Scaffold this motif. Structure first.
Motif, PDB file in Angstrom:
ATOM      1  N   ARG B  18       0.848  -1.182   0.000  1.00  0.00           N
ATOM      2  CA  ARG B  18       0.000   0.000   0.000  1.00  0.00           C
ATOM      3  C   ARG B  18       0.888   1.238   0.000  1.00  0.00           C
ATOM      4  NH1 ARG B  18       0.071   2.583   4.899  1.00  0.00           N
ATOM      5  NH2 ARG B  18       1.174   1.340   6.477  1.00  0.00           N
ATOM      6  N   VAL B  19       0.369   2.333  -0.557  1.00  0.00           N
ATOM      7  CA  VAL B  19       1.015   3.633  -0.444  1.00  0.00           C
ATOM      8  C   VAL B  19      -0.049   4.702  -0.257  1.00  0.00           C
ATOM      9  CG1 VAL B  19       3.100   3.047  -1.755  1.00  0.00           C
ATOM     10  CG2 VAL B  19       1.122   4.064  -2.939  1.00  0.00           C
ATOM     11  N   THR B  20       0.306   5.736   0.504  1.00  0.00           N
ATOM     12  CA  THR B  20      -0.506   6.940   0.623  1.00  0.00           C
ATOM     13  C   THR B  20       0.366   8.153   0.336  1.00  0.00           C
ATOM     14  OG1 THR B  20      -2.085   5.965   2.157  1.00  0.00           O
ATOM     15  CG2 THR B  20      -1.895   8.362   2.169  1.00  0.00           C
ATOM     16  N   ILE B  21      -0.114   9.013  -0.549  1.00  0.00           N
ATOM     17  CA  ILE B  21       0.540  10.263  -0.909  1.00  0.00           C
ATOM     18  C   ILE B  21      -0.290  11.385  -0.317  1.00  0.00           C
ATOM     19  CG2 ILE B  21       1.027  11.825  -2.846  1.00  0.00           C
ATOM     20  CD1 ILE B  21       1.392   9.259  -4.578  1.00  0.00           C
ATOM     21  N   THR B  22       0.374  12.465   0.081  1.00  0.00           N
ATOM     22  CA  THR B  22      -0.292  13.597   0.707  1.00  0.00           C
ATOM     23  C   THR B  22      -0.101  14.865  -0.109  1.00  0.00           C
ATOM     24  OG1 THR B  22       0.023  12.652   2.906  1.00  0.00           O
ATOM     25  CG2 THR B  22      -0.472  15.004   2.790  1.00  0.00           C
ATOM     26  N   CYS B  23      -1.152  15.677  -0.162  1.00  0.00           N
ATOM     27  CA  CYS B  23      -1.053  17.032  -0.683  1.00  0.00           C
ATOM     28  C   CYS B  23      -1.673  17.985   0.321  1.00  0.00           C
ATOM     29  CB  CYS B  23      -1.760  17.152  -2.030  1.00  0.00           C
ATOM     30  SG  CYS B  23      -0.651  16.899  -3.427  1.00  0.00           S
ATOM     31  N   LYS B  24      -0.902  18.978   0.741  1.00  0.00           N
ATOM     32  CA  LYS B  24      -1.352  19.984   1.693  1.00  0.00           C
ATOM     33  C   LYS B  24      -1.522  21.298   0.949  1.00  0.00           C
ATOM     34  CE  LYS B  24       1.117  22.832   4.420  1.00  0.00           C
ATOM     35  NZ  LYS B  24       2.203  23.174   5.389  1.00  0.00           N
ATOM     36  N   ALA B  25      -2.722  21.862   1.001  1.00  0.00           N
ATOM     37  CA  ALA B  25      -2.985  23.153   0.381  1.00  0.00           C
ATOM     38  C   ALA B  25      -2.604  24.267   1.347  1.00  0.00           C
ATOM     39  CB  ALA B  25      -4.466  23.274   0.018  1.00  0.00           C
ATOM     40  N   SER B  26      -2.109  25.377   0.794  1.00  0.00           N
ATOM     41  CA  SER B  26      -1.674  26.497   1.627  1.00  0.00           C
ATOM     42  C   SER B  26      -2.833  27.296   2.215  1.00  0.00           C
ATOM     43  CB  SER B  26      -0.744  27.413   0.837  1.00  0.00           C
ATOM     44  OG  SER B  26      -1.411  27.982  -0.277  1.00  0.00           O
ATOM     45  N   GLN B  27      -4.056  27.074   1.747  1.00  0.00           N
ATOM     46  CA  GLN B  27      -5.259  27.626   2.354  1.00  0.00           C
ATOM     47  C   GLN B  27      -6.353  26.594   2.141  1.00  0.00           C
ATOM     48  OE1 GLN B  27      -6.349  31.066  -0.431  1.00  0.00           O
ATOM     49  NE2 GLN B  27      -8.198  29.807  -0.328  1.00  0.00           N
ATOM     50  N   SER B  28      -7.509  26.800   2.761  1.00  0.00           N
ATOM     51  CA  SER B  28      -8.622  25.890   2.525  1.00  0.00           C
ATOM     52  C   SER B  28      -9.012  25.897   1.053  1.00  0.00           C
ATOM     53  CB  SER B  28      -9.826  26.308   3.365  1.00  0.00           C
ATOM     54  OG  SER B  28      -9.603  26.076   4.745  1.00  0.00           O
ATOM     55  N   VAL B  29      -9.222  24.701   0.505  1.00  0.00           N
ATOM     56  CA  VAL B  29      -9.688  24.524  -0.866  1.00  0.00           C
ATOM     57  C   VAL B  29     -10.881  23.584  -0.892  1.00  0.00           C
ATOM     58  CG1 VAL B  29      -7.497  25.106  -1.919  1.00  0.00           C
ATOM     59  CG2 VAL B  29      -7.978  22.701  -1.336  1.00  0.00           C
ATOM     60  N   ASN B  30     -11.515  23.393   0.263  1.00  0.00           N
ATOM     61  CA  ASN B  30     -12.756  22.621   0.380  1.00  0.00           C
ATOM     62  C   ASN B  30     -12.515  21.218  -0.163  1.00  0.00           C
ATOM     63  OD1 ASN B  30     -13.550  25.017   1.474  1.00  0.00           O
ATOM     64  ND2 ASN B  30     -15.075  25.497  -0.099  1.00  0.00           N
ATOM     65  N   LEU B  46      -6.820  11.404 -15.655  1.00  0.00           N
ATOM     66  CA  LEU B  46      -7.590  11.721 -14.460  1.00  0.00           C
ATOM     67  C   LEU B  46      -7.901  10.458 -13.666  1.00  0.00           C
ATOM     68  CD1 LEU B  46      -9.325  13.573 -12.728  1.00  0.00           C
ATOM     69  CD2 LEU B  46     -11.162  13.265 -14.397  1.00  0.00           C
ATOM     70  N   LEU B  47      -7.624  10.475 -12.360  1.00  0.00           N
ATOM     71  CA  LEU B  47      -7.984   9.363 -11.486  1.00  0.00           C
ATOM     72  C   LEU B  47      -9.064   9.703 -10.472  1.00  0.00           C
ATOM     73  CD1 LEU B  47      -4.616   7.521 -10.688  1.00  0.00           C
ATOM     74  CD2 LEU B  47      -6.097   7.255 -12.635  1.00  0.00           C
ATOM     75  N   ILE B  48      -8.925  10.820  -9.751  1.00  0.00           N
ATOM     76  CA  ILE B  48      -9.806  11.178  -8.641  1.00  0.00           C
ATOM     77  C   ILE B  48     -10.222  12.630  -8.810  1.00  0.00           C
ATOM     78  CG2 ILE B  48      -9.934  11.505  -6.129  1.00  0.00           C
ATOM     79  CD1 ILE B  48      -9.587   8.569  -6.856  1.00  0.00           C
ATOM     80  N   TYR B  49     -11.498  12.924  -8.570  1.00  0.00           N
ATOM     81  CA  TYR B  49     -11.982  14.295  -8.628  1.00  0.00           C
ATOM     82  C   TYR B  49     -12.859  14.590  -7.419  1.00  0.00           C
ATOM     83  CZ  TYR B  49     -16.276  12.239 -10.391  1.00  0.00           C
ATOM     84  OH  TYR B  49     -17.427  11.491 -10.518  1.00  0.00           O
ATOM     85  N   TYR B  50     -13.025  15.882  -7.139  1.00  0.00           N
ATOM     86  CA  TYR B  50     -13.713  16.332  -5.931  1.00  0.00           C
ATOM     87  C   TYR B  50     -13.207  15.552  -4.718  1.00  0.00           C
ATOM     88  CZ  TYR B  50     -17.166  19.543  -8.073  1.00  0.00           C
ATOM     89  OH  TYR B  50     -17.803  20.600  -8.716  1.00  0.00           O
ATOM     90  N   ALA B  51     -11.877  15.429  -4.643  1.00  0.00           N
ATOM     91  CA  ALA B  51     -11.124  14.874  -3.517  1.00  0.00           C
ATOM     92  C   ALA B  51     -11.200  13.360  -3.368  1.00  0.00           C
ATOM     93  CB  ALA B  51     -11.501  15.540  -2.190  1.00  0.00           C
ATOM     94  N   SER B  52     -12.366  12.755  -3.618  1.00  0.00           N
ATOM     95  CA  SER B  52     -12.545  11.357  -3.243  1.00  0.00           C
ATOM     96  C   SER B  52     -13.307  10.514  -4.255  1.00  0.00           C
ATOM     97  CB  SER B  52     -13.255  11.253  -1.898  1.00  0.00           C
ATOM     98  OG  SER B  52     -14.574  11.757  -2.002  1.00  0.00           O
ATOM     99  N   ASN B  53     -13.646  11.031  -5.430  1.00  0.00           N
ATOM    100  CA  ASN B  53     -14.452  10.278  -6.381  1.00  0.00           C
ATOM    101  C   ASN B  53     -13.583   9.705  -7.485  1.00  0.00           C
ATOM    102  OD1 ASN B  53     -17.362  11.011  -5.470  1.00  0.00           O
ATOM    103  ND2 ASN B  53     -16.193  12.929  -5.499  1.00  0.00           N
ATOM    104  N   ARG B  54     -13.685   8.395  -7.686  1.00  0.00           N
ATOM    105  CA  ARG B  54     -12.962   7.744  -8.769  1.00  0.00           C
ATOM    106  C   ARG B  54     -13.598   8.071 -10.108  1.00  0.00           C
ATOM    107  NH1 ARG B  54     -12.195   3.193  -5.474  1.00  0.00           N
ATOM    108  NH2 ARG B  54     -14.280   2.501  -6.110  1.00  0.00           N
ATOM    109  N   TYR B  55     -12.768   8.455 -11.066  1.00  0.00           N
ATOM    110  CA  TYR B  55     -13.232   8.680 -12.421  1.00  0.00           C
ATOM    111  C   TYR B  55     -13.599   7.351 -13.081  1.00  0.00           C
ATOM    112  CZ  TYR B  55     -13.202  10.534 -17.204  1.00  0.00           C
ATOM    113  OH  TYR B  55     -13.538  10.902 -18.492  1.00  0.00           O
ATOM    114  N   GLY B  68     -10.661  20.392   3.042  1.00  0.00           N
ATOM    115  CA  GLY B  68     -10.048  21.509   3.734  1.00  0.00           C
ATOM    116  C   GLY B  68      -8.663  21.801   3.201  1.00  0.00           C
ATOM    117  N   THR B  69      -7.627  21.329   3.908  1.00  0.00           N
ATOM    118  CA  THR B  69      -6.248  21.516   3.478  1.00  0.00           C
ATOM    119  C   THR B  69      -5.445  20.234   3.310  1.00  0.00           C
ATOM    120  OG1 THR B  69      -5.504  21.840   5.763  1.00  0.00           O
ATOM    121  CG2 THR B  69      -6.058  23.826   4.500  1.00  0.00           C
TER     122      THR B  69
END
Lengths: 215, 212
Positions: B18-30, B46-55, B68-69
């Motif tokens: 398993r792997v998990t990658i992280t992206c931290k936004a510098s402000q809230s991006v919902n 494209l793999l994922i949109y609106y944070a959690s939906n599989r294409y 959030g961030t």
């Protein structure tokens, strides 16, 4: 069946301009936004801007205002990006990519990319030399030597041969010219009974070469 | 503009991990976060949109999470074909901005290179230059030492090499090295050799030919 087909690679002198095209098929271009993005070697992707193809409104990344102009020809279903006042900082691969007209900008279909090299050096087409197999797997290939600018494409047997192919990154020689090799491993038993031809295209110089590689 | 900070920059795992990658936004991006996959030689997909939906069509081993961030993208069981750069994007507000990417590398078992040497073609020799090519095929790990020798004399400064990205099926690398000589110099020497040192070899392997 959705496809975005971009124009080919371009060499441009510093100070010139280039207009890149992105033709939509399998959908109506006016039903979706069109985006443009830039990727420079060893840098992060950058978004240039978007255009509403139906009515023509645009949003630009401020970093590209005065550098890029986005337009659409609705009649031909083609989006265009003009890059002006070119410098070496503009050498990059540029993609168009569609996203929803009224919603999020998840880019679900991308063009294949267009390489732009900005340089005062002249274009030069490659020479193509065989890497002949010799003394149950054999390796053979083609050497694509002395061309400018990138990129080239190499296929084998008009695309019928893909397994075992390795086309290497080009190297830049002190002459300012690139060279690359493409190799394939095949059954030794096939050397006397299967033809192996590398198909080389260097679009900036209009060079197309097919080279048979003989044991 | 909004900065997307993506970590780690590189991942090296064997197939099945398993792997998990992280992206931290510098402000809230919902939830305005998208994840793309870019395999070697291909445009991003494209793999994922609106944070959690599989294409549509994306295999179920790919997921994403966050609001959030703090955003993540997870592959539950990495496959050889997942070799790629994965990158996040925010589209909360303009300009769209991207993370710098995470290169997912596949760990596989050590594999010694198969080494091949190619003399210059007679076609090239007519033109005044001679290129000798040494191929190291389908090896792992990537680190390898290639030494050119001409009549047993070690060469420097007259060769260049490059290495492919990891193969999407067997997770190996290949390496091509070109020794470039003038035709006049090529025709003054007999034995052309490439000597390869690699962790999969118990001692260096030399492939050579005699001109003529």
């Amino acid at each position: 069946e959705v496809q975005l087909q971009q124009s080919g690679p371009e060499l441009e002198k510093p100070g010139a301009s280039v207009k890149i095209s992105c033709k939509a098929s399998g959908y109506s271009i006016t039903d979706y936004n069109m985006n443009w993005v830039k990727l420079s070697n060893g840098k992060s992707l950058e978004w240039i801007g978007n255009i509403d193809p139906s009515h023509g409104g645009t949003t630009y990344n401020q970093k590209f205002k005065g550098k890029a102009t986005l337009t659409v020809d609705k009649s031909s279903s083609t989006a265009y990006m003009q890059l002006k006042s070119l410098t070496s900082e503009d050498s990059a691969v540029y993609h168009c990519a569609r996203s929803t007209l009224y919603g999020n900008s998840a880019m679900d279909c991308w063009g294949q990319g267009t390489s732009v090299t900005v340089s005062s050096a002249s274009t030069k087409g490659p020479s193509v030399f065989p890497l002949a197999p010799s003394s149950g797997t054999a390796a053979l290939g083609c050497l694509v030597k002395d061309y400018f600018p990138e990129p080239v494409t190499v296929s084998w047997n008009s695309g019928a041969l893909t397994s075992g192919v390795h086309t290497f990154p080009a190297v830049l020689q002190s002459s300012g010219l690139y060279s690359l090799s493409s190799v394939v491993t095949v059954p030794s038993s096939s050397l006397g009974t299967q033809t192996y031809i590398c198909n080389v295209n260097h679009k900036p110089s209009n060079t197309k070469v097919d080279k048979k590689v003989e044991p | 503009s909004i900065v997307m900070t993506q970590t780690p920059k590189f991942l090296l795992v064997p197939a099945g991990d398993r792997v998990t990658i992280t992206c931290k936004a510098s402000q809230s991006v919902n939830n305005d976060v998208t994840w793309y996959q870019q395999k070697p030689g291909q445009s991003p997909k494209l793999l994922i949109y609106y944070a959690s939906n599989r294409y549509t069509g994306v295999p179920d081993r790919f997921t994403g999470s966050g609001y959030g961030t703090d955003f993540t993208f997870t592959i539950s069981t990495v496959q050889a074909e997942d070799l790629a750069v994965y990158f996040c994007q925010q589209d909360y507000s303009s300009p769209l901005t991207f993370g710098a990417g995470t290169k997912l590398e596949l760990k596989r078992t050590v594999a010694a290179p198969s080494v091949f040497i190619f003399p210059p073609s007679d076609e090239q020799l007519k033109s005044g230059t001679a290129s000798v090519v040494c191929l190291l095929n389908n090896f792992y790990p990537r680190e390898a030492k290639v030494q050119w020798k001409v009549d047993n004399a070690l060469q420097s400064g007259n060769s260049q090499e490059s290495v492919t990205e990891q193969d999407s099926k067997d997770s190996t690398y290949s390496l091509s090295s070109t020794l470039t000589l003038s035709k006049a110099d090529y025709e003054k020497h007999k034995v052309y050799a490439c000597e390869v040192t690699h962790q999969g070899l118990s001692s260096p392997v030399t492939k050579s030919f005699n001109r003529g």
